[PDB]
């Protein structure tokens, strides 16, 4: 496999070069605080609002095409299936509902800061916490609509069959959305104590 | 606080906001590169049961 | 069969080297690299061109 | 500002939190995933047996609930205003790692196990105390990254 | 198995669907108890098949009209999803119809040691093993064009180098001998392309099948054999499968056994099949195992394999309807419940 | 080279403006790749159905209207002194639209290829299938919505 | 004109065609230095040891490293790479040279006669 | 090397200009290759229509054109003493335009491919084909439009 | 922080205390799930031998249990100021107890997973089975000593 | 601290000892797989052989004792402000031991399943089988020696 | 510590030592596993023959003793005030008789396997078998001559 | 160390003379291995072949002998106080016998196999595989010249 | 300043390149072509001398590299400008790689033609001519390499 070849290789790489650096003496220079405390926080910040919403509605379209290939699949022997499924659709959007909110509630926390302010703490605070709180709800709903999806193809095949099928299965993607909804709680409270960059 | 001289954060801004676009853009281009044809629906089979 | 021409080139081709070698001949002794000791390397490959010549008489001997 | 508590310890910290929630969501939804597809995949045989052999969806939601409580009681003790020591910042994170891989283990697990001790469940009834005991098993393996998780975040605040 | 939507979603779906169409048990019960042939159609319209049959008289219906539509009907739904499938898919499928054609050529090749007729057998030739050169394939008249004709330009290629003379097979016989050894090699080549290129659990739920397919061949190889001492076992360890829970350790003694009594012991050796031989016949046993492995591959959800679960159990489905059209037609009910449902 | 406005500022909003529409094209491509693989699988055999298939390849060109419009307001909004917020805001705008029109294209693609394939044989599969292309390109209307409110905030309090 | 669309390639295949010629004259060269310095290395590693010492024993050494430096010369040399640069030499006329002058293909002219041939086998 | 005009700027014009010639013409010659395995599949059959089922081939080349002209473009403005602003630009327009351009490639060659094989057997399906792939087309245009845009925005008000 | 106990020390005994966890965490998930997938794909056969292939779990389970003394251990062992040599020896332990108990996971998974099979298959087999898994055990209990040695070595003389 | 003992030196000597048991667990866990994967086909048939062919897995054990003795003998010789030659010799030792032991029971492992397989059928083959299992032994017994003479290079004659 | 001679030459040393036995132990593990194999699945039809073929497991042997001798020569050269120039010789080395033996065990693994099934059926391929691998392990032998040469440079008139 | 003999500058000349050996055996193993098996399953039906297709086995052997020659005279030349000059070229020289023969080695041992099997049947293809032989082993003798020509530019003329 | 300690790095690793991914491309070339030849030539042996021109003139890919290694070589100095080793290098690579592709080329065309030839005989010039085109490949790697490092040490200072 190439690729692997290539990602060993820039394993050994990265590797040798921190080895050279620490045998020099000189293995301080690479300081990942430095490099965190030097970039400017809206890199961070903003970075987290466009992954956010970004990978909210990756996951959210994810699992929309796992679920609607199946629902249409199932559909063409058993077309009454699609009306009563269509929730299976509500609970693979609802993600990107939830990526939405929490991306125009980030945009808030979005201000300028002075010249001194720029690195302060509550700037690099912020800028940090809109970053991984972005992160957070992105992937969190992304691996939601994949299991929403997911769940919602096979409620879809078993509601081909019939539709106690369905009303038994609902729950599973009901808990497939909560991990969505978990997602949303956590993010948003984890960038409610950031306050903006002023 | 000088950071190394050639990597600057500045560079490295640059150059980890390109290594994530240049990530979803190899996603992006397996994703796509992986696209197949139906062929069977297009082709005309000689299968006499078939038509 | 095979070492009869084989042999046959070979003494030739070694007295002719043994020649060179025995008259001091610059491209291939002279240099520090080069072996020096004319006369020894010489009789060396005289002995050599002696013995293809014994391998010339065995195998010829067959015919 | 005192050396033993940099300006970028929120990043770490923060990068626990993320870790946590995200990949304890992760291991919960291949879990819940994986069994829904043994539930839908008894559901056309033996319906019946759909409302009794859902418990590996409840277990990866409370894999879900694990990691939830460990990101939250992460999230609570950070603030810009509030000191912060570099080594809270890597307690957190090392919390995050510990919650977020195991339970993403035990999310894997649980769901192996429920998708084939559910799909062997429709052939006889009496697997389903052995499937709950795996799962109870797999479950309590994801417990553990949960207490090393509280006890990490105990020791790091302190 | 969440990146088998992108590309056969639909058709997972639409196999499904089909599948919710296999007669259930109360189905063939219903089936079972029809007095006559045209009132089996008329209970048998109530199913999915509905009005498929209705083209016909019903004085003209006849169980060899019932296996011949039912079986058609199977081919369009078959070739249907096929024309629908999209690469390592559709290569699959390929592959489940080289299964077939590996028959279809072999029952070419006869007619072609004695040219005695052409046409009636592609008439006869069923489509499910159909390719495009066949129509070519039929005109040849001499055996090695024949040869050339099905070692090029066909997806037979790899079978017929893998194992074949141009003139080797005149002396074989096609049924012994040249059909056995086209699945064997069939078996392995399918069992290889499975673990290469198919996503779990696809993977174990084709490799168990595909590995029962060739425990089947094999048993049926083993007791076929004793009657026809011609067959040195050195051969029949060529035409033994290679794959499946028998090879490595059973296969070798299945092939060197002479009797039934040694295919006995070295058949109850392995578990699934103590008193699979002793009581009963074995096409009966055999096929009740294939639905018990189909069932599973329909257990599965996002996996590739359901196609061909539905393919066998589909087949194993109008094959019971067609003992049970012969068990009326014949009047011969009292072995009307060999059917085996699953659904 | 102003503390405020590096010189490589520019950097951001450069590659947010071309990634908004790199990647809404991308998805775009795919989703009428896709649908036109679908539709040319459904109508050989029923060409009445031509008219009527069409629409996700409509809906994967409005995925590229929102990369445009994105990448037209960038544009708009893209200066050489401009300090590193504005650059950011704009490279944060150009990735949320691109990555959800990728996805939604995605969508868009794989959803009407399996429902022209189903509507090749039930016909009132097309409720369901216009309903949940809708659902899908709400998607990349978020993106563009998310980078709309960015960069109508970029010129908010700019150096 | 009609064939113009001939001429126009003929004349592009031409030009194109000679630089490539001019340019693949250069692997006479290349052969002449593959050939001269493999020479070299061989005679530097089978001759220049041959000598060793000079000792009794180099009396053998030196017989054995000439019958292998001779086996090499023939079997490597002038089999491997002398029929290599005939046949580059050849690859000459198949094209640099046939390519300007040859106009095409012609019937050959094989006359009805007899040759002896398979006097015992076929 | 002032500081807002670094002697590495041209860099990234030249690898802008490079890119957009680049990768556009990655996506003609897929798209170009994918179309012509679907000509030389069908119309060995149906030889009528070898003149008629080209125009995939045709705007597969206008890819290929819009790179040709956007690159052409960019080097009227690239120079040595230019500000690392708009090398930056003309790289993004550069990346722009080209990876919208390979992004209309593929879905040109799929579409094409697709349409070929169908229209072998369904003459209705090639105003089909036709609408698909201006649909295709029109992607690698908006790409075109962007590149434009930035190109336009890389000369005016610089230091 | 003093250069024997700098401010980024306890980021190596983070990482060992937490690897400890992850990967015998890692390695008891893997052993379990295959040897519920045996045990599962086996009962259906002989249910009344469930409660005697349960062992393997359990001893799937006790890896686990090793990761969590082990980390609760380092846990103990943490803190603010503590020692760099502290912090990479903990760190030797957590990767060395998880290693070993993700080495003795996916061993007792793969022989309980035949070992499961063999059981219905032949009952006295359960005895070489069982064994068989104790030696595979004891790897884990062995990366438990070297993790436990390191620990207490860790702290004793660092200033 | 001092040049040749300076704070990052029992990095490696930490690493030496998690990695001489970490990959010597590897082997000995891939052996032990294997040989009970072989033990639990063969020995369902012939049951009075699961004391005889139980060696293989006996001596992947023993690998995880040169293991386990190597480690406990560097975490032993570990140290805070040791010499950073005694951190490099150590981790050297370490990984010495640890690689082949995981080469030896990737060996043991292989021999050991194809020799239970083949000792199924034919009885005499056992000694041949032990006799090879031997060598591969043998092979993680040059790397405990090896292992042994870095660590007693370690100690003396160091400042 | 001086230029020549500086703290972290040690490790290249110790790597080199560690190496040496590493790579020779895969490349023999590698060896003796599919000799064994070959004999352990030929073998059961003809015990005769066991005694005589297991001639690849000695060579593999032979090849562990030669990154064995290598290894004991480097740690008796070891130290922590050792020349750099001394570190990178038998660093170069120990790589050097490592790898070769690795591929001098990999060649034989392959011989000896083929040549046992072959040599069931025919008796005389035995002849064959020896002399093909006298000329795969020459390939160690070879990479032993090179680490010698190393070795016996490296502590000459060295500073 | 001065500028133009850095104490690092052994290194690559260290490196070279090592990755000759490693190289060139890396490739004779491979040659030898797939010679192996083609002679093996060739003249099992036909064993009084076996003296004459053995050739390729002593062809990769003579690979072996090009590689240590190249790092025998490399080895002579490494110096403790050498200029960096010389170490890069012996390392260039190292690479380029090494990968070349690496090179040779899998042509001769592809062509060697599937010749061997072809003169089973044929014996006059005998002389072909020679002369294809010779044409692979050329390739190597290549990579010799190369190398010992850089080993004699590496100390002449040099600081 | 010009010449920095590791200049000479860049003409080595130049020098090194141009044959080993030269060799690289005419072993796959003989690699390809000789089981091609030794497949074919089983069923009609007589035919193997003709049938070798494969091999050959892949062979002429390692020897390309060859002669540009040894006409690069002979410009390496210790004191070499930076830009006298990046000119080798960048010659070293454009012979090397090129030579790579022209012996992937001749090798699936050699083999391809091989396998024609074994049934009839007139595909022999045709495969000439393609494998020709295939070989000036490494004809145009040479020049590329012949005039860099002509340029090489025009005006260095």
Redesign the interface.
Same mark, same amino acid.
């Given at each position: 496999s190439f690729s692997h070849f290539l990602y060993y290789l820039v394993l050994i790489v990265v590797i040798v070069y921190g080895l050279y650096k620490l045998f020099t003496g000189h293995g301080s220079d690479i300081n990942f605080g430095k490099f965190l405390l030097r970039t400017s926080p809206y890199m961070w910040a903003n970075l987290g609002i466009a992954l956010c919403v970004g990978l909210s509605v990756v996951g959210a379209a994810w699992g929309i095409f796992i679920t609607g290939s199946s629902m249409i699949g199932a559909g063409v022997r058993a077309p009454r299936i699609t009306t009563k499924n269509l929730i299976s659709i509500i609970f693979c959007e609802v993600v990107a509902i939830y990526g939405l909110i929490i991306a125009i509630v980030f945009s808030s926390k979005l201000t300028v800061a002075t010249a001194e302010n720029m690195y302060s703490k509550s700037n690099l605070y912020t800028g940090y916490s809109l970053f991984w709180a972005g992160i957070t709800v992105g992937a969190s709903n992304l691996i939601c609509g994949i299991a929403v999806g997911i769940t919602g193809a096979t409620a879809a095949i078993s509601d081909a069959a019939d539709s106690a099928l369905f009303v038994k299965i609902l729950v599973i993607e009901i808990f497939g959305s909560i991990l969505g909804l978990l997602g949303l709680i956590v993010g948003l409270l984890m960038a409610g104590k950031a306050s903006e960059f002023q | #606080?000088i950071?190394?001289s050639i990597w600057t954060?500045?560079?490295?801004?640059?150059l980890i906001? @390109?290594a994530?676009?240049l990530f979803?853009?190899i996603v992006?281009?397996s994703?796509? @590169?992986?696209? #197949? %044809? /139906?062929?069977?629906?297009?082709?005309? @089979? /000689?299968?006499? %049961?078939?038509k | 069969w095979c070492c009869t021409v084989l042999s046959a080139f070979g003494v030739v081709i070694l007295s002719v080297i043994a020649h060179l070698f025995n008259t001091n001949h610059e491209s291939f002794v002279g240099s520090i690299n080069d072996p020096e000791d004319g006369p020894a390397v010489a009789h060396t490959v005289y002995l050599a061109a002696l013995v293809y010549l014994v391998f010339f008489v065995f195998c010829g001997f067959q015919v | 500002s005192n050396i033993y508590a940099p300006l970028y310890a929120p990043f770490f910290g923060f990068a626990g939190c993320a870790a946590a929630m995200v990949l304890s969501c992760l291991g919960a939804a291949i879990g819940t995933a994986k069994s829904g597809i043994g539930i839908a995949g008894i559901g056309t045989f033996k319906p019946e047996l759909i409302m009794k052999s859902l418990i590996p969806v409840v277990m990866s939601g409370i894999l879900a609930i694990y990691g939830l409580v460990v990101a939250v009681l992460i999230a609570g003790n950070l603030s810009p205003t509030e000191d912060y020591t570099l080594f809270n910042g890597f307690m957190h994170l090392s919390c995050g790692l510990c919650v977020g891989f195991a339970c993403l283990s035990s999310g894997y697990a649980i769901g192996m196990v429920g998708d084939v001790g559910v799909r062997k469940y429709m052939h006889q009834p009496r697997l389903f105390v052995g499937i709950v005991l795996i799962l109870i098993f797999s479950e309590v393996l994801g417990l553990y990254g949960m207490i090393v998780a509280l006890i990490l975040n105990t020791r790091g605040s302190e | 198995g969440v990146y088998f939507n992108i590309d056969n979603g639909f058709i997972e779906g639409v196999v499904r669907g089909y599948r919710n169409g296999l007669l259930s048990n109360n189905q063939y019960i219903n089936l079972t108890q029809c007095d006559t042939l045209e009132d089996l159609k008329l209970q048998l319209s109530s199913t999915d098949y509905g009005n498929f049959l209705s083209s016909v008289s019903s004085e003209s219906l006849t169980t060899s009209l019932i296996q011949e539509y039912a079986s058609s009907k199977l081919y369009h739904e078959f070739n249907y999803i096929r024309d629908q499938s999209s690469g390592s898919t559709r290569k699959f499928m390929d592959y489940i119809t080289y299964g077939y054609m590996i028959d279809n050529v072999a029952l070419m090749i006869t007619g072609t040691i004695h040219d005695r007729d052409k046409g009636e057998i592609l008439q006869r030739c069923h489509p499910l093993g159909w390719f495009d050169t066949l129509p070519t394939l039929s005109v040849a008249t001499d055996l090695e064009s024949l040869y050339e004709t099905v070692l090029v330009d066909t997806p037979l290629a790899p079978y017929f180098k893998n194992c074949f003379d141009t003139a080797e097979e005149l002396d074989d016989m096609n049924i012994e001998i040249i059909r056995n050894k086209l699945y064997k090699a069939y078996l392995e080549d399918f069992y290889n392309f499975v673990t290469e290129e198919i996503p779990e659990p696809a993977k174990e739920c084709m490799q168990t099948l595909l590995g029962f397919e060739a425990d089947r061949r094999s048993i049926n190889i083993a007791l076929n054999s004793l009657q026809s001492s011609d067959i040195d076992p050195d051969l029949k360890s060529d035409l033994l499968p290679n794959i499946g829970k028998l090879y490595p350790l059973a296969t070798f003694h299945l092939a060197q056994a002479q009797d039934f009594e040694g295919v006995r012991a070295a058949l109850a050796n392995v578990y699934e099949y103590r008193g699979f031989l002793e009581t009963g016949n074995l096409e009966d046993h055999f096929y009740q195992l294939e639905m018990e492995l189909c069932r599973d591959a329909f257990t599965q959800q996002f996996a590739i394999s359901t196609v061909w679960a539905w393919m066998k159990s589909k087949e194993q489905e109008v094959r019971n309807i067609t003992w049970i059209a012969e068990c009326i037609a014949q009047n011969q009910r009292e072995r009307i419940n060999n059917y085996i449902s699953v659904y | 080279m102003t503390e405020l406005c590096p010189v490589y500022a520019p950097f951001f909003g450069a590659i947010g403006c071309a990634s908004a529409i790199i990647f809404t094209s991308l998805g775009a491509a795919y989703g009428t790749a896709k649908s036109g693989v679908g539709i040319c699988a459904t109508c050989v055999l029923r060409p009445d159905l031509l008219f009527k298939n069409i629409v996700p390849v409509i809906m994967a060109g409005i995925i590229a209207i929102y990369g445009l419009v994105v990448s037209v307001l960038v544009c708009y909004s893209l200066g050489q002194k401009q300090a590193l917020y504005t650059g950011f805001i704009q490279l944060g705008a150009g990735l949320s639209v691109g990555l959800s029109g990728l996805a939604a294209g995605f969508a868009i693609g794989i959803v009407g290829d399996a429902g022209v394939r189903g509507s090749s044989q039930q016909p009132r599969l097309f409720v369901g299938m216009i309903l949940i292309l809708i659902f899908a390109e709400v998607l990349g209307l978020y993106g563009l919505i998310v980078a709309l409110l960015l960069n109508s905030r970029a010129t908010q309090d700019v150096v | 004109g009609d064939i113009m669309i001939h001429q126009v390639i003929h004349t592009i295949e031409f030009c194109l065609n000679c630089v490539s010629h001019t340019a693949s004259y250069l692997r006479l060269w290349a052969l002449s230095l593959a050939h001269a310095q493999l020479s070299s290395v061989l005679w530097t590693m089978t001759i220049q040891i041959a000598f060793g010492f000079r000792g009794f024993v180099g009396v053998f050494m030196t017989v054995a490293l000439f019958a292998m430096w001779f086996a090499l010369t023939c079997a490597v040399l002038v089999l491997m790479e002398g029929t290599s640069a005939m046949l580059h030499s050849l690859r000459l006329h198949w094209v640099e040279s046939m390519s300007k002058f040859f106009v095409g293909e012609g019937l050959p002219y094989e006359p009805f006669a007899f040759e002896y041939k398979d006097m015992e086998v076929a």
């Open positions: - | #606080d950071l190394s954060e500045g560079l490295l801004m640059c906001v @390109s994530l676009l979803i853009l992006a281009l994703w796509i @590169s992986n696209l #197949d %044809i /139906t062929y069977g629906a297009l082709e005309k @089979s /000689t299968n006499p %049961i078939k | - | - | - | - | -």
